[PDB]
Every structure is written in C-alpha cells, then in structure tokens.
Amino acid sequence: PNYCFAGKTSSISDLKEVPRKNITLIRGLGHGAFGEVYEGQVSPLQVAVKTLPEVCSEQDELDFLMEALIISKFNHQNIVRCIGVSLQSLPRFILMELMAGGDLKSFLRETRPRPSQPSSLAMLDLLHVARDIACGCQYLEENHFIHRDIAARNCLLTCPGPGRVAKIGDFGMARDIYRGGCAMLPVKWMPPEAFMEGIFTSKTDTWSFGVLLWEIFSLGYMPYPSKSNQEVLEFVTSGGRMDPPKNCPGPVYRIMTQCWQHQPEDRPNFAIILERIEYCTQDPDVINTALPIEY
Ligand SMILES: C[C@H]1Oc2cc(cnc2N)-c2c(nn(C)c2C#N)CN(C)C(=O)c2ccc(F)cc21
C-alpha cells in the first residue's frame, strides 16, 4: 500500500524502522479509546509513542501504517515530527516528537488565568498559538493536503511555558478519507458545503481554523455552547455564527467571521489569515487587552 503526497510516492519501506531494543517506555500520557500513547526514549532521544493494539483488524493495521506514512512525509516546523516507527515488533509503534505541553484544548482549560495565577496567559500567547497553527495550515494548503479536522484537540504544544510552539499533531480524519459515522463527525468544525454535499477544499480548513480561533480565544470552551451537533448544523446553514469569546478583541473576532463566510470563495486562504494574525499582534490595543480571570 502506497502513499502519495506532493509529487512523491512512498511505501512502508520508506519509514524509518527503529530497533525495538532501542525503545523504552517511560509513562502513559493519557491513553485514548483505541491505542495508547506513552512518553518514551530512543537510544537519549525523547519521544511520544503511539501504539497499535495487538488485538486489531487488518483494516486497523492498514490505518496505522497509513498514519505513519502521512506524518513521516510532512516537513514543517508546525507539524509534529515522526522520529520513526517500530512495525516489525508487536505491539507496533509510531514514534513522534514529544510535545510536553500536551494538547491545546487541555492546555487552554488548565492554563486559564485564575486569581492565584492571574498572569498565566496573555493575548499575545494566544495569537502566537494561532499563528503557529495557521503556518502549519498554510503548509498543508500549499501542498494540497486537506486536514478536515482542524481543532484544538488535534494540536500540541512543545512545552507549557513561555517559549511554547503549537503544532498540528493528529491526522486521523485525513487518514480515514485517504483510505466512521455521523455521530463521530466534527460537525461543529465543518462548513455548510462540507456536511451537506461532502465537498472538501482547503477552504474547508479555513472554516475549521475559524472555529479553532474561537476555541483559542475562549480559552478552551466547546464551540457553540449548549448546542448539539444537529442544532449547530441547522444554525450554521441558516447563517448563524458564534458570538465573540469573552473579551475577544474586535480585530481577532473579524478573522473568525471571515473564516466563516458562507461561500468558500469569500473565505481567506491561510496566507491572508497569517497576514491578519500578524497585524493583530502588532496592534497595542489588541495585545494589551486583558483576558478574563476565571473565579
Ligand atoms: C498521539 C499523541 O501525540 C503526542 C501527545 C503528547 C505529546 N506529544 C505527542 N506527539 C501529550 C498529550 N498529553 N500529554 C501530557 C503529552 C505529553 N507529553 C496529548 N495526548 C495524550 C494525545 O494522545 C495526543 C493528542 C493530540 C494529538 F494531536 C496527538 C496526541
């Protein structure tokens, strides 16, 4: 089974097989419903290890291989690196760049300004995260790769503290399409034409990035508070959009509303999104805006 990205075709042969003896698991990182994730080290190189359960179907096996090929073929600083794989021993491993800041949704929720830590985050921190992910998205766009699932839960941070870099860290939806059910669709992140006609383009990711921006500036809230998937589907198709997050500067909210234009042609590409984020970061009135302190 081959994988095609950009101009090139790659195969399982192209993956970097790391000798299993060189790999040591250290601790769990919060395992999902299928496959575990560990902190590990390679002989030392610090890594995250994604595992394939040994009790799995052949389709699961092909899914795991395809994920390894997809991530291994990306080359961008805002996309998590694949250090290698261990596919010749069981359970099979994919080895990733260790993003010690964890996923972005959890980071935002856990790092909200509080009376004890009133200065944990500032507007600039959020703008830098937004810029980081938009840079990753621009790389995907210019290489004609549609992510399909841009959302805070699928982004990672290099570290919790000040020098953090945000990166896109999961490509499971894209993998599935390359190779499911309504209840599992990221409805709240999808544009009208996506869930209606099943049409996908890079402007699909623009819409989702708008929702990510809302997640970021809301400090990790679930989009469309109190609305179910179907309610959001009908709301969005009717022209409904989310209100600004609490204390969100107008220039930032306007990037969101542009990302959520009904017509894909009316939505900005990621080059433009990056330009607008950069302008926001220059504006003193934006970056001097205080985030809410949760009590
Ligand atoms: C496949 C997995 O990858 C990594 C996870 C972590 C770090 N680095 C990588 N590469 C991580 C997480 N939490 N913490 C505390 C750490 C640490 N250190 C998040 N997590 C448990 C995930 O499963 C997850 C979530 C989203 C996503 F995009 C990829 C992943």
Core attributes:
monomer, ALK tyrosine kinase receptor, 10 helices, 295 residues, alpha+beta, 2 domains, Phosphorylase Kinase, domain 1, three-stranded antiparallel beta sheet, five-stranded antiparallel beta sheet, binds the ligand C[C@H]1Oc2cc(cnc2N)-c2c(nn(C)c2C#N)CN(C)C(=O)c2ccc(F)cc21, Transferase(Phosphotransferase), domain 1
Question: What is shown here, in short?
Answer:
With 295 residues, the chain is of the alpha+beta class.
Main sheet, how many strands, which sense, barrel? 5 strands, antiparallel
Rg (C-alpha, Å) = 19 Å
CATH fold name of the largest domain, please?
Answer: Transferase(Phosphotransferase), domain 1
Structural class: alpha+beta
What fraction, in percent, of the residue positions are helical? 25-40%
Largest beta sheet: strand ordering: 3-4-5-7-6
Number of strands: 10
Assigned CATH architecture of the largest domain: Orthogonal Bundle
Number of helices: 10
The overall number of domains is 2
Order of helices and strands: EEEEEHEEEHHEEHHHHHHH
3D architecture notes:
The active site is at residue 149. This is ALK tyrosine kinase receptor. It is found in: Cell membrane. The modification Phosphotyrosine is found at residues 3, 38, 178. This protein is α+β, with helices and mostly antiparallel strands and 295 residues long. It has two domains: 1-98, Phosphorylase Kinase, domain 1 (2-Layer Sandwich), CATH 3.30.200; 99-283, Transferase(Phosphotransferase), domain 1 (Orthogonal Bundle), CATH 1.10.510. Helices cover 37% and strands 15% of the residues. It has ten helices and ten strands. The protein has a five-stranded antiparallel sheet with strand order 3-4-5-7-6, with helices on one face. A three-stranded antiparallel sheet has the order 8-9-10. 38% of the residues are buried. Residues 29-30, 32, 37, 39, 48, 50, 80, 96-100, 102-103, 154, 156, 169-170 line the site of ligand 5P8.
